[PDB]
Amino acid sequence: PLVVEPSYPDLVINVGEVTLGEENRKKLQKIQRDQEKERVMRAACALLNSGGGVIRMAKKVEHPVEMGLDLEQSLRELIQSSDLQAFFETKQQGRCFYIFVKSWSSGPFPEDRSVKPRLCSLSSSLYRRSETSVRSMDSREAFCFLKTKRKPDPADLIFQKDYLEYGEILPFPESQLVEFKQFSTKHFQEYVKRTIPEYVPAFANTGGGYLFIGVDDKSREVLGCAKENVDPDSLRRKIEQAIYKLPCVHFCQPQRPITFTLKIVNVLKRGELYGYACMIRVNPFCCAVFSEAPNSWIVEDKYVCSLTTEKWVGMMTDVYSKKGLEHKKELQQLLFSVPPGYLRYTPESLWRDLISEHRGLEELINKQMQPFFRGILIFSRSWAVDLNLQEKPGVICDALLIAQNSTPILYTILREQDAEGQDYCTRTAFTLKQKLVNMGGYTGKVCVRAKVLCLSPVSPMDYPASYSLAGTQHMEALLQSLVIVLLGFRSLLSDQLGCEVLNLLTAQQYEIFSRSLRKNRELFVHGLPGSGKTIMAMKIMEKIRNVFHCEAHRILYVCENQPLRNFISDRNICRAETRKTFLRENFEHIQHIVIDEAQNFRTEDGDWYGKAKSITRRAKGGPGILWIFLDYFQTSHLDCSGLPPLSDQYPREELTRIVRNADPIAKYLQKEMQVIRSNPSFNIPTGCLEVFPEAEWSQGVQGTLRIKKYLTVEQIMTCVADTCRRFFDRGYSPKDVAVLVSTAKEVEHYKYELLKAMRKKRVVQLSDACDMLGDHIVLDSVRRFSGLERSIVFGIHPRTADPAILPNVLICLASRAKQHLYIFPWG
Amino acid sequence: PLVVEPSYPDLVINVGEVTLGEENRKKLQKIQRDQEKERVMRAACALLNSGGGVIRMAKKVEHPVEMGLDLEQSLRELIQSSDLQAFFETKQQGRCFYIFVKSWSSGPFPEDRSVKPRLCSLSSSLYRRSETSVRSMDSREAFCFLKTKRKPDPADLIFQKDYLEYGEILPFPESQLVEFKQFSTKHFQEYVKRTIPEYVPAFANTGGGYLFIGVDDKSREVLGCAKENVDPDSLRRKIEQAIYKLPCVHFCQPQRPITFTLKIVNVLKRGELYGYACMIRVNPFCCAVFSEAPNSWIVEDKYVCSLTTEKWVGMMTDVYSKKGLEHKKELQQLLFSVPPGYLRYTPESLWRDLISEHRGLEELINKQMQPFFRGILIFSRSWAVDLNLQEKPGVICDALLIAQNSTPILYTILREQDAEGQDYCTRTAFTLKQKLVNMGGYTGKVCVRAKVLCLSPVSPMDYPASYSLAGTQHMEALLQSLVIVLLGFRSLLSDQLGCEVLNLLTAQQYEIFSRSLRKNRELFVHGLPGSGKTIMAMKIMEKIRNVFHCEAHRILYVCENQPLRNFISDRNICRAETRKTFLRENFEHIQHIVIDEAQNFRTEDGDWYGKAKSITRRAKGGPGILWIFLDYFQTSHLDCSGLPPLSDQYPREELTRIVRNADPIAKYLQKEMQVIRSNPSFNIPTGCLEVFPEAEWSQGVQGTLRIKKYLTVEQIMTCVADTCRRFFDRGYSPKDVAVLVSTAKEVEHYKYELLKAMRKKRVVQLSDACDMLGDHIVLDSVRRFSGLERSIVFGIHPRTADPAILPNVLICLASRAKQHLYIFPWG
Ligand SMILES: [Mg+2]
Ligand SMILES: [Mg+2]
Ligand SMILES: [Zn+2]
Ligand SMILES: [Zn+2]
């Protein structure tokens, strides 16, 4: 059989000695020539169906030869096109001849799913009657036929006769429904055994028909066979055995077998019996009938294996990120934009960390990157772990190079020379290349080279020039498949792409929401947890100054909490003040007002709503903009907020799509929101919590959620400290992490005890929520962190004075986390 | 040549005498066989590209015969599939053999428009190099190739040599870029003539290449040709002319010819000159190169004609209603709903008129329709006029039968028998069948039979059974293609289908607009003329009743004009009253208030806006719905309306898409709306008229708009009577017509005057604007018709006391017409 050889970062199949050249292949016998051709075509079909590769064959001569006309024509039949260069390219060196095969279909969701078949075959074994002939369906014809089947006569008079006269003339000719076959007595049982599999499936696949055996084709004479050789009882058994042996695949209930009527009639000569005539009526079949298993091949594990009939039909009729496929062009420009003129190293934070730890690493990389003047060099502490492979001790970092006028190269950097290092780098380069096609949907010609570098001071296959990245179009198309591949795994770059997907979902919802500015002057925005309520408020104030041409100091932002005030005030889009500041000072110059977390406001210090209404209505442009953002699920107290009654809060906009938290976090939010509806707080209005999320809305972003309980406070700190160190080793920055506790008075206690464990991790710098621009882990209370968000959030000991508000802190805490949430409840 | 036979309701081509049967065709000489096959495939390709038809051929035999393996294979190559039954079906009676051909691609906008090619060809004349061979692209390959071209070496070392030794071995073999031709002196000039169109277009179409002439293929020896026979200057000219003769098609600029380098070199034997060798380097071409004109055929008028190279490329790369195609299933189910169990005659209104005017027509139609038990019989006074053909005097009516277990039949009824009757029906049945395919996009097998019936007391082909209508699915699909065909013509059923497209457009805009009910309690709707403002107001009251679960009498509709008030009351969706009635009577029982035509309201009777707010705010469910509909383009007076200032009219909704008027009416409104912007009325606030229609919005419904000026009052009424008589004769109803005058005081004058001219047209009854349910023509003033609408409107002398309000009168008049508007301005 054929075996893929594992000394290469690709699928390489050795077919052995092959005769090449047309004059050399002519001199061969038909048997040997056909065996060689079939071996080469099995290898080519396997590589077409398995994501591409190289066919290695040994030629018997030194001088360059052509491949041969029969091999060319078989490849043309294999891809159903004369454009043989699009999928095949040939190289030869001395005694070895290479065919580089490109993948037929790429990705789980190709752009041609309903157009082109997913598989190539040597034969589909699907035949149909085509007027007076039987033709096998090619891959496209078989694809259309199975698509059709999956969707939810003068000849009968002769068939009704009980006997036939010898030499009788049949009035009808051969047609779409009639086939005449002459029955020879020397091999009659063998002849009928091979006639059945080729004409019965053809009739059943198209409208049925009549098969007459014993009728001369040219003269239409009924002759039959010798009476002494044919046994009508024995002949019947052979025919029915062959008909029921034909493989059948059903797309329907019931699954009744093939239906036919077989009649053996006597052929009478001069009134005396001369022999028997075999007549078969084949009824049309509900589904596809195969004469045998399809001749399609695929590579699975280390062997070249043939697809079974049921598996072949499955692929011919039929983590993957839909968001990654949709936004792949936007995502690539954000993270993997290729700069013209120089080579870019990403991630830059990880690159600085690596060169600081390892002396001479920067010179090793820089000396290697001299030939390449444009592209990107993507670093990772282990690209194997990023692709769900095994971590190798001794590997410093893995770098993937995507540069112009070069093939992709995977660099594995070792601290010391290792024998198994080459196998580790080849296995990772193989996995990456296969993911780029079968997962990233790359439809071009791709190869990833495996190179090992050592810090301490098998031959490489030569691919055609079409495998080198020619320019920006090739590099961008390849990097857009890496975006899709990365988003299906858990890694730093996967998390950096996941954050940007959440930013694109928010930007999509904002454009729908931003259309309300023209239609409204006063608006109440009832946005669900995780719906981007604060992000929309920031973007609206950017649109207000653009649309109304007012200055930034003419727009006022009012919020309850100081950390959220500081975050907004640092953006320089408006003036940001606290409710207590709002009631005290005078804001007569303000034209537009945006109020956020208004459900957290309090009446004890004055009527803030009347003042906000008064300022905007007396403004120059009639009633100025007064938009009030609130979330009744995140109420922080049982006091009266000062908002108008729920029936007076009109007009309304509702943000029901969760677009700021990953899929595990979002599902936790909907679960906890259902608990609130089952027991709403008394201060909250009765029907406001009846706002439900979208019926079926998903983010398409991977996330993390673990709930760890019954741990002591000291054990809690060690779990937080160990988790952060693992995050920071892979390249995560400390400014992606927040630690949120129940109350602000416990912030000082937990800060000391966390710093006690975190000092062992070379991290002794912690900040509160009032500072979010520094590169430090923020530790503060859940309520004081309102409106802010971090990628990684640790929830430690949720608590409140009244258990009625207790389910709120879980919603308030979980909505602060974008991708990773760790909860440590009381026990 | 091949000529279309004109006596049939289909494209019929007679190819004459053809030998059929495999044994009969094998006995023929090759030239005769190929000529007959080529004639048959010319006919088949023409019918495939021209909407389908029948190939008529006379066979040299009486008994039934098969068609022949070469003919079968040629048809399979023509359609690129072994499914020969889907496009070709054969019949024979006596000495005639019929091939029934289905259309390859149907409709201007096929579903596979971006997938499958539009044309079938016997050859594309597009060759490309496929490794060491030249292969022609079939229709799918050429389609993809032209799509790709549309978007925006060791052999070089030998090429640099100036002289070559006789018998020198070339190191490289034949490949994708290298071809060797052996050059014989007997036909050396003739050989060059043929080799250039074969290999140069193949190289130019795929990446260029090298063509060496004078090198043996098998041994790669440089031989050249005899020095005595070759003229190197003459030989160079011959090659240059042949390359420039190749037809080229450009999808770009510039359009330079084929770039190549031709080199003639000397062949030296034993140090002595032996002859010359020709080496040609072909650069890749920017676009498609043809070896000759494509072999594709089409039917134009009564001839079978071949497409030119530029016309073939145009079809392969590249009144029709967009709205009709998208709504074809809903439009079909509205008008042409097929009933199970009985045969339906449509239209009922036209059918009653026909049987009353003509004695014995009812029994004549019922006698013919007895074999048909399920289907629809579509009547018209002249189906030829509907399809832009000339009317025939003496034709009572035409009917199109679409029934189960039958082919479509077009019946023409004559009052006396006529020789030209059968020619008139056949030309209409031919035109209808070609429209159903080429315009309505029917992808099935269709034939329209032409039958002529006489009221006063060539042979049709027997089509295959696959041309009959088997059941509901075949009948519905054909009726959906008739909807698309009818909407592209001017006829009764076109206007009934055009009105329903307007109702579907209005229902689409309401679904967008009805989402504001959950968000707003008080809302101001600023709709444009023709935006469906009164239609939305009625539909909202249905949703108010359903959403708020209040009964109908709790909803109040307030308008300014009595005729609009009675229109709303007749639908029983609310309580509907006028402004004066609203201010007088008590409405404490009212919860929700909808106000329409609010710009026409007046202040002197009281403060209606405050009363509306008071009633709605004091409702049980807090603030009730208070929606106010208004358009400042239909402002009928210059007084104060009582509306709050434009700055206080928030929240605001705008209906900017025109969905109630046909395209000629819609375009007139936009032009007239532009005049109002340049001269706003003083009573309208400054920023009101700045509402602009949708950037690019079209109705996709065709209509009529004519201006007839300088006519006298007596002349005007005769034209109205003549136009109304023409509409009613064609089957329109009087309730589709309104005659609108400038002032209500002149209504009594024009009513008597019109009745004087209209009595000759056999109706002596007119109805007022307050009565819309009667089947009578409505005559009143423009102002009293506000909020109402008719299909046909005659506008007579638009006039007002102030020329400032005059330009609105054209808007208030034109927007009342859905499809047909006739204006008679002052002279
Ligand atoms: Mg046969
Ligand atoms: Mg050759
Ligand atoms: Zn089945
Ligand atoms: Zn060009």
Q: At residue B398, what is the residue type?
A: D
Residues with Cβ within 8 Å of residue B557, at least 6 apart in sequence:
B537, B541, B565, B568, B574, B575, B576, B577, B594, B595, B596
The experimental resolution of this structure, in angstroms, equals 2.8
Residues on chain B touching A66 (C-beta within 8 angstroms): 131-132, 173-175
> For residue B654, how far is the Cα from the chain centroid?
31
Class of domain B127-289: alpha beta
Nearest to A313 by CA among A284, A349, A289, A330: A289
Q: Is A62 on the interface with B (CB under 8 A)?
A: no
Q: Is A151 on the interface with B (CB under 8 A)?
A: no
Cross-chain Cβ contact A82/B135 below 8 Å: yes
DSSP string, A79-118: HTSS-GGGTEEEEEETTEEEEEEPPSS-SSS-TTTTTS-S
**B128 Cα: distance to centroid of ligand 4 (angstroms):** 17
User: A704-824: same fold as A520-690?
Assistant: yes
B138 to chain A, closest Cα gap in Å? 9
What is the Cα–Cα distance from B330 to A406, expressed in whole angstroms? Answer: 57
Radius of gyration of chain A (CA): 37
Nearest to A491 by CA among A736, A730, A820: A730
Copy the structure tokens of residue A257.
């077998």
Q: Which of A67, A75, A83 should we substitute to test contact with B (largest number of B Cβ atoms within 10 Å)?
A: A83
| Sign of the C-alpha dihedral computed for residues A106, A111, A113 and A116 taken in this order | negative
Cross-chain Cβ contact B173/A652 below 8 Å: no
**A683 Cα: distance to centroid of ligand 3 (angstroms):** 63
Closest ligand by atom to B254 CA: 4
∠ CA B516-B520-B524, nearest 5°, is: 85
**What fold, for A704-824?**
Rossmann fold (3.40.50)
Q: Give chain B's length.
A: 827
The one catalytic residue in B59, B181, B392, B433 is B181
What is the Cα–Cα distance from A438 to A444, expressed in whole angstroms? Answer: 12
B88 to chain A, closest Cα gap in Å? 10
DSSP string, A710-750: S--HHHHHHHHHHHHHHHHHTT--GGGEEEEES-TTHHHHH
List % helix, strand, coil for chain A (3-state, nearest 5): 40, 20, 40
What is the Cα–Cα distance from A779 to A791, expressed in whole angstroms? Answer: 14
Point out the residue among A131, A175, A650 whose CB comes nearest to the CB of B623.
Answer: A650
Residues with Cβ within 8 Å of residue A100, at least 6 apart in sequence:
A52, A53, A54, A55, A88, A89, A90, A91, A445, A463, A464, A467
Q: Give chain A's length.
A: 827
Q: Interhelix angle for B328-335 vs B472-486, to 10°?
A: 100
What is the Cα–Cα distance from B220 to B206, expressed in whole angstroms? Answer: 24
In angstroms, the Cα distances linking A782 to A561, A794, A800, B229, B373 are 12, 10, 11, 99, 76
The DSSP bridge pattern shows strands A777-781 and A737-741 to be: parallel
Domain B520-690 maps to which CATH number in 3.40.50.300, 3.30.420.10, 3.40.50.720, 1.10.287.130? 3.40.50.300
**A133 Cα: distance to centroid of ligand 1 (angstroms):** 7
> Any idea which residue has 């009910």 for tokens?
B517
What's the number of CA atoms in the CB half-sphere (13 Å) around residue B543? 16
Cis peptide before B254 (omega within 30 of 0): yes
Cross-chain Cβ contact B133/A651 below 8 Å: no
Strand order in the sheet with A178-181: A163-165, A260-269, A272-282, A209-213, A178-181
Copy the structure tokens of residue A758.
């975190």
DSSP state, residue B221: B
B531 marked as binding residue: yes
Q: Interhelix angle for A69-79 vs A30-49, to 10°?
A: 30
A152 to chain B, closest Cα gap in Å? 13
What is the Cα–Cα distance from A792 to B42, expressed in whole angstroms? Answer: 72
In angstroms, how far is the first alpha carbon of chain A from the final one?
Answer: 62
Residues on chain B touching A128 (C-beta within 8 angstroms): 82-83
Please indicate whether residue B238 is annotated as part of the active site.
Answer: no
Asked if residue B572 lies in contact with residue B589, where contact means CB atoms within 8 angstroms, the answer is no
Asked if residue A537 lies in contact with residue A786, where contact means CB atoms within 8 angstroms, the answer is no
Q: Interhelix angle for B747-758 vs B713-730, to 10°?
A: 60
Catalytic residues of A: 181
Nearest to A368 by CA among A416, A412, A417, A421: A412
Q: Is A309 on the interface with B (CB under 8 A)?
A: no
B656 marked as binding residue: no
**B248 Cα: distance to centroid of ligand 4 (angstroms):** 9
Method by which this entry was solved: cryo-EM
Point out the residue among B76, B175, B651 whose CB comes nearest to the CB of A66.
Answer: B175
Cross-chain Cβ contact A84/B130 below 8 Å: yes
∠ CA B128-A101-A440, nearest 5°, is: 110
In angstroms, the Cα distances linking A657 to A528, A634, A697, B712 are 8, 16, 7, 65
How many CB atoms are located within 10 Å of the residue B376 CB?
20
For the stretch B248-254, contacts whose Cβ atoms lie closer than 8 Å and that sit 24 or more positions apart, written own/partner, are B248/B285, B248/B287, B248/B288, B248/B289, B248/B290, B249/B287, B249/B288, B249/B290, B249/B309, B249/B310, B249/B313, B250/B286, B250/B287, B251/B146, B251/B149, B251/B150, B251/B287, B251/B288, B251/B317, B252/B152, B252/B286, B252/B287
Three-state helix/strand/coil letters over A526-570: EECCCCCHHHHHHHHHHHHHHHHCCCHHHEEEEECCHHHHHHHHC
The DSSP bridge pattern shows strands B4-5 and B12-17 to be: antiparallel
Point out the residue among B84, B133, B136 whose CB comes nearest to the CB of A69.
Answer: B133
> For residue B293, how far is the Cα from the chain centroid?
30
A109 to chain B, closest Cα gap in Å? 18
Q: Interhelix angle for B533-548 vs B492-513, to 10°?
A: 50
Asked if residue A72 lies in contact with residue B133, where contact means CB atoms within 8 angstroms, the answer is yes
| Domain boundaries of chain B, sorted by first residue | 4-101, 127-289, 323-438+446-457, 520-690, 704-824
Q: Please tell me whether residue A351 adopts helix, strand or coil conformation.
A: helix
B286 marked as binding residue: yes
What is the Cα–Cα distance from B446 to B443, expressed in whole angstroms? Answer: 9
What is the Cα–Cα distance from B630 to B381, expressed in whole angstroms? Answer: 43
Nearest to B430 by CA among B297, B301, B296: B301
**A286 Cα: distance to centroid of ligand 3 (angstroms):** 4
**What fold, for B4-101?**
Ribosomal Protein S8; Chain: A, domain 1 (3.30.1370)
